[PDB]
Design a protein around this ligand. Structure first.
Ligand SMILES: *[C@@H]1O[C@H](CO)[C@@H](O[C@@H]2O[C@H](CO)[C@@H](O)[C@H](O)[C@H]2NC(C)=O)[C@H](O)[C@H]1NC(C)=O
Lengths: 49, 50
């Protein structure tokens, strides 16, 4: 005799995509923070890419 | 008589020394795209810039 049985299988596919910024997240509205990040250079443009 | 205001430009140089073309940063979305992608020719696609 033979019988048929079912089995579940769950694999994740993708997560929610998240994007951040250095201009707003690091400093709220102060232009001095922008001045220090611009004199220091590009540190998180590669992170954005 | 003209007026001058401070912003950033992007310039493309040549081996002879003389500049042959230039583009600004804030006049059009295409100009902002060229300013942020560090390139003149822009391929088709989605670009998160600012
Ligand atoms: C194989 O086994 C299944 C159960 O595991 C059998 O199905 C039942 O069979 C009995 C009698 O053999 C019936 O009274 C039940 O109503 C059946 N269950 C149902 C229809 O859900 C099946 O008959 C067996 N097959 C063989 C060839 O022996």
């Amino acid at each position: 005799n033979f019988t048929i049985s079912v089995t579940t299988e769950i694999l994740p596919v993708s997560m929610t995509k998240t994007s951040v910024d250095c201009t707003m997240y690091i400093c709220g509205d102060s232009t001095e923070c922008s001045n220090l990040l611009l004199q220091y250079g590009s540190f998180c443009t590669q992170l954005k890419r | 008589v003209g007026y001058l205001q401070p912003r950033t430009f992007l310039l493309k140089y040549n081996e002879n020394g003389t500049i042959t073309d230039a583009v600004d940063c804030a006049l059009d979305p295409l100009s902002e795209t060229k300013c942020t992608l560090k390139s003149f020719t822009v391929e088709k696609g989605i670009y998160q810039t600012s």
